[PDB]
Amino acid sequence: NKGSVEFQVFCFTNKIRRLTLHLELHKKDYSSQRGLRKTLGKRQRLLAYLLKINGVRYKELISKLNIRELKT
Amino acid sequence: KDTIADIITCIRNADMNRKGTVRIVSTNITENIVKILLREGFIENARKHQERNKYFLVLTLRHLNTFHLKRVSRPGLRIYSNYQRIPRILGGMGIAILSTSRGIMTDREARLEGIGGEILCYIW
Amino acid sequence: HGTRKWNPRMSPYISAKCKGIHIINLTRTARFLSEACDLVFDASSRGKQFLIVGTKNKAADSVARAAIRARCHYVNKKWLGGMLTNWSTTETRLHKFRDLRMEQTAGRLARLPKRDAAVVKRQLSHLQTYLGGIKYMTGLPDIVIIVDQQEEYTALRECITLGIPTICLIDTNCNPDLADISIPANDDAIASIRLILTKLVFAICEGRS
Amino acid sequence: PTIKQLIRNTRQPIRNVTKSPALRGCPQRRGTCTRVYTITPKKPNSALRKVARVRLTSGFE
RNA sequence: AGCGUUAUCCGGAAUGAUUGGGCGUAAAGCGUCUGUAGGUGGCUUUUUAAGUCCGCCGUCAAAUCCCAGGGCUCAACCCUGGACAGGCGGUGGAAACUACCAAGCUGGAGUACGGUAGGGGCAGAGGGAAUUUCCGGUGGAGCGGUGAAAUGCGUAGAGAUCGGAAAGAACACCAACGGCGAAAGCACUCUGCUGGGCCGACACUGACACUGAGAGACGAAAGCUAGGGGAGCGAAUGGGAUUAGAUACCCCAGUAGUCCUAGCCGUAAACGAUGGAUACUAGGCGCUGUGCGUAUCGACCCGUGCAGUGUUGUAGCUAACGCGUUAAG
Ligand SMILES: [Mg+2]
Ligand SMILES: [Mg+2]
Ligand SMILES: [Mg+2]
Ligand SMILES: [Mg+2]
Ligand SMILES: [Mg+2]
Ligand SMILES: [Mg+2]
Ligand SMILES: [Mg+2]
Ligand SMILES: [Mg+2]
Ligand SMILES: [Mg+2]
Ligand SMILES: [Mg+2]
Ligand SMILES: [Mg+2]
Ligand SMILES: [Mg+2]
Ligand SMILES: [Mg+2]
Ligand SMILES: [Mg+2]
Ligand SMILES: [Mg+2]
Ligand SMILES: [Mg+2]
């Protein structure tokens, strides 16, 4: 598949969502928790890049994926 | 990070190991820097090639002295200078490579040109 | 010599290589064979004295016969330290050793006991082992030749200390910066030794005039 | 260290260790003596050295 | 015609090291990781001219300092003239560099794929010996322990020896010059869910990078708060010895705790006593993981690339010891 910016966020959005349901049961899996914050951080720096390059794509991507916008 | 900070070292380490070739990276800035060492007599020859779309340059060092080098203006602290405070390394045995509005030149060439600039590295 | 024994120092003077064994370059050395024979031929005309340092068992007698052709000197056995640097002690042992050969001529051995004559016998025998090819030196040489760098590591350093040019064993075992004159390819066999040794000893003969 | 750390004022000078707080910087100072006596000095030396307990006008005993 | 003492400031003091220091062992790297602000940031062609450089204008009073000249019989001192350097503002130009603006690339980073090793983590099932206790059979005097002895167990039948019930905790051999993980740490077996790394390449992205003040998470044992469990070992506390003494070392018994599930505590020589990222800088040996090629193309072996992991060692550094491509260069 492609490697566009919005596509990487879509895969992380599923990779993140897939692990939340896992931690509801295996909450003591702290090694996976260290991996969960990576994908949460990788998308943070990509969306941080998408923001200052084009705000139109930002408002459209966050609207369909139901993403919380950051203050400041 | 700072390319030129790496350029000055790849030439330094080559003299400590006492090698002839360097295989230094090619850019718009380095081609002007190396061009000064040819005319000034610090390097015997330079030569260009490529392996990918990128480019490189191959130098030819000379065979108890040591090829001293030093960087001055860093990214964390840039250093500029006016005409009256142009350095004079070792009374003339050394030179300073500095960037003017009319490109890069030697400090001696700036003494005649009458225009200071950003000192980047000293040589002796 | 091998993949586990090649020194990276000789890399300018290497052409190719093979299955395990190493292949030396004969091109660069040929210039140095000329520079060597030119310097040795020119030096011999002025009347200098030379020295050869050979103690390898394979070329112990070859270096001995090599010195008889010219008026140079050889070192068949080990270096025993301070031969050239501690020359003041060497003159004492040579002045000593020179006298004992005159001591044996006299009939004083008769009036010495059995054991005392044995000590003087074994004393002179020990000096003959190490002070054979030096009996007619009477001074310090001006150029010193090294046949082996590894086994005679000490001899190469006193030359550097006293500031004397020299020839070395620039094959992959050693460091080439120790001698100004460079002649690789001598660790193969006597063929590599005699081909070079006889060639350099030959040049001394015509230089002597 | 890093120049950003220098801008934090990581470096400060050292304060004075003046050896006469009682004088309050003045060269001399008057005082009434309270009790004269002697005292044994440190171990290697040995003597009865003379001293005087003084009440200075600067508010120091 | 002053000389010394004391006090105060600077220097010496590179002893707060922008110029101009250091953190392996001398004082100094958070226990570790993720990340906000902040700092810095790959390459190529343009835009602007904020920074930066040049030329002019105004101004930073006088005195003082600096240079020259003059006047007190000289000097101090007084006077005349003129500064340089540096700061602010305006103005006209130069456009490399920092920065800005408009487009480009793929080497750094990441995604999609296709392969691959491992005690990565969590959860649930399965397995054997060994030890202990009880049940009995057999049998009859010691057993056990120590530098020597005793306490202690035992004819109310010990210990030993076969057979059997049950429980708890921990996994010999494999096992290292070994693997994984950010650390702390992870080893009897499988299975489930799940994280990370490495390599290949012809899908793609187009600098989306590094570090990280605060903050947050994880975090050996010990210990605490409830609820369970407790075989063995074992602080404490007793007893028997050694000793002048023995609130110890030794020996016999032994509580908490050691284990499980919830949570607190957040400390260790939490050490590689060495922060992280990146580029460059001789080699020798051999250990994995994954490719390539030769080869017996059955694997192997041999030869090389990449990412790691250990041991010697050159230059160089280091007060020295020692580090040394995984640097303390
Ligand atoms: Mg740049
Ligand atoms: Mg100071
Ligand atoms: Mg400093
Ligand atoms: Mg210091
Ligand atoms: Mg200590
Ligand atoms: Mg310390
Ligand atoms: Mg971070
Ligand atoms: Mg003024
Ligand atoms: Mg430009
Ligand atoms: Mg912090
Ligand atoms: Mg515990
Ligand atoms: Mg601590
Ligand atoms: Mg530990
Ligand atoms: Mg520490
Ligand atoms: Mg640490
Ligand atoms: Mg080493």
Strands (E), chain C: 14-17, 22-24, 50-53, 73-75, 143-146, 166-167
C181-CA/E155-C1' distance, Å: 102
Nearest CA in chain B to D4: B76
- Residue ranges, comma separated, of all CATH 3.30.1370.30 domains in chain B are 1-66
CATH of B67-124 among 3.30.1490.10, 3.40.50.720, 3.30.565.10, 3.40.50.620? 3.30.1490.10
Cα of B71 to nearest chain D Cα, Å: 17
Q: Which nucleotides of E are covered by protein (CB under 7 A)?
A: 6-10, 16-18, 21-23, 33-45, 51-55, 85-86, 93-98, 105-107, 110-113, 120-123, 181-183, 192-196, 203-210, 217-219, 262, 277-285, 303-304, 315-316, 329
Give strand letter and number of the nucleotide nearest B10 (CA to C1').
E280
**Do residues D33 and D61 make contact, with C-beta atoms less than 8 angstroms apart?**
no
Cα–chain center distance at C83: 12
Q: Any idea which fold B1-66 has?
A: Ribosomal Protein S8; Chain: A, domain 1 (3.30.1370)
Tokens of C1: 């010599």
Tally of CA atoms within 13 A in the half-sphere of B33 that contains its CB: 25
Please give the angle made by the CA atoms of C8, C11 and C17, to the nearest 5 degrees. Answer: 100
Strands (E), chain B: 24-25, 45-49, 56-60, 69-71, 95-100, 103-106, 118-123
The residue to which tokens 């070292």 are assigned = B9
- Residue ranges, comma separated, of all CATH 3.30.1490.10 domains in chain B are 67-124
Task: Name the residue among C15, C164, C28 with its Cα closest to residue C83.
Answer: C164
**Do residues C67 and C52 make contact, with C-beta atoms less than 8 angstroms apart?**
yes
Spatial strand order of the sheet with B95-100 comes to: B69-71, B118-123, B95-100, B103-106
Task: Name the residue among C35, C69, C29 with its Cα closest to residue C50.
Answer: C69
Chain B to chain D, count of Cβ pairs less than 8 Å apart? 3
Give strand letter and number of the nucleotide nearest B17 (CA to C1').
E315
* Other CB atoms within 10 A of residue C38 CB: 12
Tokens of B97: 């490579």
Which residues of D fall below an 8 Å CB-CB distance to B? Answer: 2-3
How many A from CA of C47 to the centre of ligand 3?
62
DSSP C107-123: GGGTTS-HHHHHHHHHH
Task: Name the residue among B122, B32, B15, B17 with its Cα closest to residue B73.
Answer: B122
The dihedral formed by the CA atoms of C24, C28, C31 and C32, expressed in degrees to the nearest 10: -60
Give CA–CA dist C135/A32, Å, rounded.
85
How many A from CA of C31 to the centre of ligand 1?
50
Which whole-number Å values give the CA distances from B94 to B66, B74, B90, in the listed order? 13, 20, 6
**Do residues C171 and C5 make contact, with C-beta atoms less than 8 angstroms apart?**
no
Residue type at B93 in one-letter notation: M
Cα of D14 to nearest chain B Cα, Å: 28
Give CA–CA dist C187/B19, Å, rounded.
27
Give CA–CA dist A46/B102, Å, rounded.
39
The residue to which tokens 């009440």 are assigned = D55
Task: Name the residue among C51, C2, C93 with its Cα closest to residue C200.
Answer: C51
Give CA–CA dist C134/C143, Å, rounded.
15
Query: Of all helices (H) and strands (E), which one includes residue A37?
Result: helix A30-53
Helix (H, G, I), strand (E, B) or coil at B60: strand
Contact B77 D3 (CB under 8 A): yes
Tally of CA atoms within 13 A in the half-sphere of D58 that contains its CB: 13
Contact D2 B76 (CB under 8 A): yes
Its sign, for the CA torsion B51, B57, B63, B69, is negative
Give CA–CA dist B80/B98, Å, rounded.
9
Which residues of B fall below an 8 Å CB-CB distance to D? Answer: 76-77
Give strand letter and number of the nucleotide nearest B117 (CA to C1').
E53
**Do residues B98 and B78 make contact, with C-beta atoms less than 8 angstroms apart?**
no
Please give the angle made by the CA atoms of D47, D52 and D57, to the nearest 5 degrees. Answer: 155
Give CA–CA dist B121/B71, Å, rounded.
4
Strands B69-71 and B95-100: unpaired
Nearest CA in chain D to B75: D3
Give strand letter and number of the nucleotide nearest D21 (CA to C1').
E7
Give CA–CA dist C56/D46, Å, rounded.
76
Q: B83-121 b/e with 16+ CB inside 10 Å = b?
A: eeebeeeeeeeebbbbbeeeebbbbeebeeeebbbebbb
Experimental method: cryo-EM
C18-CA/E151-C1' distance, Å: 82
